[PDB]
Design an enzyme around this catalytic site. Structure first.
Site, PDB file in Angstrom:
ATOM      1  N   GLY A 111       0.778  -1.228   0.000  1.00 36.66           N
ATOM      2  CA  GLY A 111       0.000   0.000   0.000  1.00 36.66           C
ATOM      3  C   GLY A 111       0.809   1.276   0.000  1.00 36.66           C
ATOM      4  O   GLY A 111       0.289   2.327   0.381  1.00 36.66           O
ATOM      5  N   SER A 131       0.675  -5.844  -5.909  1.00 37.29           N
ATOM      6  CA  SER A 131      -0.130  -4.802  -5.263  1.00 37.29           C
ATOM      7  C   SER A 131       0.534  -3.453  -5.514  1.00 37.29           C
ATOM      8  O   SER A 131       0.669  -3.064  -6.688  1.00 37.29           O
ATOM      9  CB  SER A 131      -0.335  -5.186  -3.796  1.00 37.29           C
ATOM     10  OG  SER A 131      -1.179  -4.254  -3.138  1.00 37.29           O
ATOM     11  N   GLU A 165      -9.774 -11.133  -4.138  1.00 40.64           N
ATOM     12  CA  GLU A 165      -8.922  -9.980  -3.860  1.00 40.64           C
ATOM     13  C   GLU A 165      -9.418  -9.155  -2.677  1.00 40.64           C
ATOM     14  O   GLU A 165      -8.611  -8.523  -1.986  1.00 40.64           O
ATOM     15  CB  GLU A 165      -8.822  -9.088  -5.099  1.00 40.64           C
ATOM     16  CG  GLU A 165      -7.984  -9.660  -6.231  1.00 40.64           C
ATOM     17  CD  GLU A 165      -6.491  -9.559  -5.967  1.00 40.64           C
ATOM     18  OE1 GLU A 165      -6.102  -8.934  -4.956  1.00 40.64           O
ATOM     19  OE2 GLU A 165      -5.705 -10.104  -6.773  1.00 40.64           O
ATOM     20  N   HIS A 223      -5.746 -11.818  -1.118  1.00 45.53           N
ATOM     21  CA  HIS A 223      -4.737 -10.941  -1.695  1.00 45.53           C
ATOM     22  C   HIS A 223      -3.346 -11.288  -1.176  1.00 45.53           C
ATOM     23  O   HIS A 223      -3.130 -11.392   0.033  1.00 45.53           O
ATOM     24  CB  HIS A 223      -5.099  -9.496  -1.342  1.00 45.53           C
ATOM     25  CG  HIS A 223      -4.181  -8.462  -1.912  1.00 45.53           C
ATOM     26  ND1 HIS A 223      -4.265  -8.028  -3.218  1.00 45.53           N
ATOM     27  CD2 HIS A 223      -3.187  -7.742  -1.339  1.00 45.53           C
ATOM     28  CE1 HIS A 223      -3.351  -7.097  -3.429  1.00 45.53           C
ATOM     29  NE2 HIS A 223      -2.684  -6.906  -2.305  1.00 45.53           N
TER      30      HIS A 223
HETATM   31  N1  LIG Z   1      -6.430  -1.084   6.409  1.00 41.51           N
HETATM   32  C1  LIG Z   1      -5.974  -1.628   5.143  1.00 41.51           C
HETATM   33  O1  LIG Z   1      -6.512  -1.310   4.137  1.00 41.51           O
HETATM   34  C2  LIG Z   1      -4.799  -2.607   5.111  1.00 41.51           C
HETATM   35  C3  LIG Z   1      -3.992  -2.669   4.023  1.00 41.51           C
HETATM   36  C4  LIG Z   1      -2.926  -3.557   3.997  1.00 41.51           C
HETATM   37  N2  LIG Z   1      -2.688  -4.363   5.060  1.00 41.51           N
HETATM   38  C5  LIG Z   1      -1.567  -5.291   5.060  1.00 41.51           C
HETATM   39  O2  LIG Z   1      -1.308  -5.831   3.793  1.00 41.51           O
HETATM   40  C6  LIG Z   1      -0.255  -6.760   3.813  1.00 41.51           C
HETATM   41  N3  LIG Z   1       0.252  -7.023   2.474  1.00 41.51           N
HETATM   42  C7  LIG Z   1       1.423  -6.470   2.080  1.00 41.51           C
HETATM   43  C8  LIG Z   1       1.915  -6.712   0.808  1.00 41.51           C
HETATM   44  C9  LIG Z   1       1.222  -7.507  -0.046  1.00 41.51           C
HETATM   45  C10 LIG Z   1       0.049  -8.060   0.348  1.00 41.51           C
HETATM   46  C11 LIG Z   1      -0.442  -7.820   1.626  1.00 41.51           C
HETATM   47  C12 LIG Z   1      -1.765  -8.426   2.103  1.00 41.51           C
HETATM   48  N4  LIG Z   1      -2.098  -9.620   1.929  1.00 41.51           N
HETATM   49  O3  LIG Z   1      -1.282 -10.540   1.253  1.00 41.51           O
HETATM   50  C13 LIG Z   1      -3.491  -4.295   6.148  1.00 41.51           C
HETATM   51  C14 LIG Z   1      -4.559  -3.411   6.175  1.00 41.51           C
END
Ligand SMILES: NC(=O)c1cc[n+](COC[n+]2ccccc2/C=N\O)cc1
Ligand SMILES: *[C@@H]1O[C@H](CO[C@@H]2O[C@@H](C)[C@@H](O)[C@@H](O)[C@@H]2O)[C@@H](O[C@@H]2O[C@H](CO)[C@@H](O)[C@H](O)[C@H]2NC(C)=O)[C@H](O)[C@H]1NC(C)=O
Ligand SMILES: *[C@@H]1O[C@H](CO[C@@H]2O[C@@H](C)[C@@H](O)[C@@H](O)[C@@H]2O)[C@@H](O[C@@H]2O[C@H](CO)[C@@H](O)[C@H](O)[C@H]2NC(C)=O)[C@H](O)[C@H]1NC(C)=O
Ligand SMILES: NC(=O)c1cc[n+](COC[n+]2ccccc2/C=N/O)cc1
Ligand SMILES: *[C@@H]1O[C@H](CO)[C@@H](O)[C@H](O)[C@H]1NC(C)=O
Lengths: 530, 532
Positions: free
Chosen positions: A120, A201, A327, A440
């Site tokens: 993100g 992502s 996703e 995802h």
């Molecule tokens: N509050 C949110 O939208 C949010 C966004 C991202 N994450 C953590 O994402 C971890 N992540 C980091 C890199 C790639 C994928 C992923 C997720 N699933 O695989 C937690 C909350």
């Protein structure tokens, strides 16, 4: 005595690597190579500067520090979330990259894969276990490079027009690493004329933005975008909203005592102080929205990604894009009312309607009504199981599937050859609940051959699957074509053909959720302008 | 000398009828009973006046004239279109009704069915062969009544507020006929306390407007709405647009030597020959369209105190039984009258460009945004250019927008607000149908089975279709007698379960949803898009 294979001289000086073990043989690794001056003190928020030459031998035997970022604490100790958290100490001195090569080092030019992690634009690190490049390098005999880039406010705080905080410096961190690859990867046996970018992502969104920025285009030759696109509604921000978010962050941390005074005050605060407040500059409650992201200011991106994709000539480009089966499910536990990984999340109609405003933030009531109309089964408007899957579809289609479907369609129709996939295997080791399906980010471990690690509990079938996916990805890096067997056809705007990736042989289908994506990509923009 | 069975005394005077033969026995028919003074000369555009009493015996022995109306010219001599054209001479002297009763006259009070024909409020007649009431009365032993009402400008030209052309006089013709039934149907053996209105298309929209007009609501007890609803986008017009259409029509015929004084404007219109008004009636529509009609009921606070939708949403309908339904392909019939690429004489395999152009014809007078919302939902984005799919999709557009979704909305609100509703979909393509196969079961082609026309010996229906016709007549008559078509069961329609039955040669099959996904767009979202 000392292994000559682990000694490399690059333009900046000498390095010492480490020999790594893998079930199929050894691998050469050079970890924590500095490619930029540490962006600390007065250098924070500024574009990166090339690393100055050093004397002696740099120890490149271990991963370096993770860039300062937020650490998720929703489910402490839960493997599903801890696998993404920093596994090294945090520091603003974090601009390092890593190189994996076969052992002994290749004597002939070897195709190069460059990995850009997601998260993100506020998190991520090249040192995570799931990004371990030893299995790809041994199995497919490529050179693998991954870099750290600044995230959050440190990489994407922007006061547009100001030089003290121009924005997009995290993307410039990636470009500097790509320039470092051009100038130095041959010393490791890599071929600088065969560089494939791949990312997931926000990493895929970064790959897409290097495709649309001419100074980055000369640095690579092929691109892979996994579960992300630069035209995602979360991937970029306008100049006005970027200035507003940068200004509110200064206020929340006690600044200032013009843009110069504001940035100077921000530079006096500890890095952890900025991290603790960055999520509070978002205008409303939401999921899949991030505070500091690439900004469209006419420099790095001379226009919006959607505009640049429509006006681009993409003949001679090969891209591999795809999504996972579910996703949206992962993001629902971070704000959607009624959701949790520890129950079935069988929500009510009222919670579904409330989740729509969380999953589709900052749109008019009319736009939200259009979403509810499209994603409601009006024969079962209140079935909790259907409502749970529907909100997962809303979040997944809006942020990932349809942005990727639009990029694939426009690239193909404008010269590029596109290969599209949907990853549909739920890992036997997956620790998330069953209702989340294939969430995802859980195709990455198969692309990197992690199931080949014998100290993990993947099945024999899953290991063969990982070897299949590594072959597809490496075939594409070598030739622009994953094919070798059932053939993987190119994605076209008309036929819209893609393959499903699971334990079964390849199955060809049509339409990346064509009905839903017609809504997000064709009708909804018209509704928001009028 | 006379047959006492064919002599009846009503409030206005004495009548003499005829004894009709049916495949199942005789039936008494009183055809052409005057119920209003002829709306001619100075009374054109005026509300109807009760027929003054008469001495002697009026011969009610044949159908009277068709009210002045347009005659379809598109496929001359074609059976599919000629069956709806007038089968009597055109005249403004046309306010007559018909009564069928069993022979001999009923001993005890018998339920009454009152038919209101359709025709887009611009055409129609109670004398059409397809509305022959002799088979219903023979088979099910009810009293059947049908009436003529003024159509086109003569029935619905409105200068709102004025006393010389107040509008909705065609609906007042219908109400006068209903008041006549209350005062006089007992002389024929009918029960004035068990009156069931039923109508098709604009007749069904008329039935719904009597449901929503308190002065009419006391004149009947049950309602059947076939392929029509008062909340249809074609069934009503606002006061301003009604005045605009009436003023342009007057202008097109030289009145006055535009707008101005209302009394003088209508007085000029009254001097024009009836055919002259009919010839220019279609020129007042704002754009090229299908399923849009020049002069329709006007929402002016009098007959309709509000829009039919608001009256439906605010209405208390406890104690009301209602039977509604549609045919399988409501839209196909209307596409050959303007949609580009369409014709009954070829397959009408249209292109994508013709589909997009037809959307504006089928959904007229909406913004570009609303039009693209229609395209989004009726396009199959895996096959966006397939001609056969596009032909069906445009048929669905016109059918859903004008019939199915207005009926579904009417059914849902009545059920939720106290009424007992029964819903059907008519899915049988008649063996004698002369329209091409791609049109499926077109608008209006369930009527012949409800009136039992297949029982006519000079016709060529199969034996299966005669059994089917007798089964449908039983459903309709059971509903008229009890408020319930049953005695395979037919469940009521509710807003949640949304259950309806399919009417064809097979036994009843219960289904769910009157094209629920499509009608959620038309009934729930698209209004929000138009108001914003
Ligand atoms: N509050 C949110 O939208 C949010 C966004 C991202 N994450 C953590 O994402 C971890 N992540 C980091 C890199 C790639 C994928 C992923 C997720 N699933 O695989 C937690 C909350
Ligand atoms: C519009 O005109 C009517 C009268 O219609 C005819 O044209 C008039 C100019 C005049 O010649 C009338 O005799 C014609 O009948 C007006 O109504 C009449 O008003 C007069 C005067 O108040 C009265 O003596 C008549 O009885 C009325 N006749 C009716 C009721 O038709 C009417 O007031 C005019 N309206 C306007 C100002 O537009
Ligand atoms: C089917 O015909 C329609 C309209 O045409 C009439 O009927 C045809 C069977 C044939 O007899 C024609 O000569 C008649 O004019 C075609 O669509 C129309 O084509 C005409 C061509 O002049 C033109 O007006 C418009 O393009 C269309 N719309 C109309 C009705 O005016 C249609 O293409 C024919 N189907 C095919 C080609 O198979
Ligand atoms: N008054 C007129 O000129 C006029 C013109 C056209 N139409 C409608 O066109 C014919 N039509 C169009 C659609 C469905 C049926 C029919 C047949 N009607 O007899 C009505 C009146
Ligand atoms: C029905 O078919 C018969 C036999 O072809 C024919 O003689 C008769 O005229 C037809 N009648 C109708 C109503 O079509």
């Amino acid at each position: 005595r000392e292994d000559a294979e682990l000694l490399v001289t690059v333009r900046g000086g000498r390095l010492r690597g480490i020999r790594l073990k893998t079930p199929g043989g050894p691998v050469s690794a050079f970890l924590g190579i500095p490619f930029a001056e540490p962006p600390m003190g007065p250098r924070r928020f500024l574009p990166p500067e090339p690393k100055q030459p050093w004397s002696g031998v740099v120890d490149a035997t271990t991963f370096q520090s993770v860039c300062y970022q937020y650490v998720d604490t929703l489910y402490p100790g839960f493997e599903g979330t801890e696998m993404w958290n920093p596994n090294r100490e945090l520091s603003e001195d974090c601009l390092y990259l890593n190189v994996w090569t076969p052992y002994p080092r290749p004597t002939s030019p070897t195709p190069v894969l460059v990995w850009i992690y997601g998260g993100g634009f506020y998190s991520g690190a090249s040192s995570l276990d799931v990004y371990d490049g030893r299995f790809l390098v041994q199995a497919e005999r490529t050179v693998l490079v991954s870099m750290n880039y600044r995230v959050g406010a440190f990489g994407f705080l922007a006061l547009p027009g100001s030089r003290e905080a121009p924005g997009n410096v995290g993307l410039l961190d990636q470009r500097l690493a790509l320039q470092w690859v051009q100038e130095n990867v041959a010393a490791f046996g890599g071929d600088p004329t065969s560089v494939t970018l791949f990312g997931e992502s926000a990493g895929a969104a970064s790959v897409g933005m290097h495709l649309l920025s001419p100074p980055s285009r000369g640095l690579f030759h092929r691109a892979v975008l996994q579960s992300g696109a630069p035209n995602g509604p979360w991937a970029t921000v306008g100049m006005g909203e970027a200035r507003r978010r940068a200004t509110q962050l200064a206020h929340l941390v006690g600044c200032p005592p013009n843009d110069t005074e504001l940035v100077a005050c921000l530079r006096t605060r500890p890095a952890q102080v900025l991290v603790n407040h960055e999520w509070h500059v978002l205008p409303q409650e939401s999921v899949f929205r991030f505070s500091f992201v690439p900004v469209v200011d006419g420099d790095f991106l001379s226009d919006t990604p959607e505009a640049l994709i429509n006006a681009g000539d993409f003949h001679g480009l090969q891209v591999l894009v795809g999504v996972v089966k579910d996703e949206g499910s992962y993001f629902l536990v971070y704000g959607a009312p009624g959701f949790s990984k520890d129950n079935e999340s069988l929500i009510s109609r009222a919670e579904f309607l409330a989740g729509v405003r969380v999953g589709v933030p900052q749109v008019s009531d009319l736009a939200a009504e259009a979403v509810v109309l499209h994603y409601t089964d009006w024969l079962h408007p209140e079935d909790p199981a259907r409502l749970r899957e529907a909100l997962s579809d809303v979040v997944g289609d809006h942020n990932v599937v349809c942005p990727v479907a639009q990029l694939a369609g426009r690239l193909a129709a404008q010269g590029a050859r596109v290969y599209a996939y949907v990853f549909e295997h739920r890992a036997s080791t997956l620790s998330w609940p069953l209702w989340m399906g294939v969430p995802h980010g859980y195709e990455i471990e198969f692309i990197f051959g992690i199931p080949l690690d014998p100290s993990r509990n993947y099945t024999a079938e899953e290991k063969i699957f990982a070897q299949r996916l590594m072959r597809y990805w490496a075939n594409f890096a070598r030739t622009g074509d994953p094919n070798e067997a059932p053939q993987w056809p190119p994605y076209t705007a008309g036929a819209q053909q893609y393959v499903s990736l699971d334990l079964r042989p390849l199955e060809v289908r049509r339409g990346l959720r064509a009905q839903a994506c017609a809504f997000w990509n064709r009708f909804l923009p018209k509704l928001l302008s009028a």
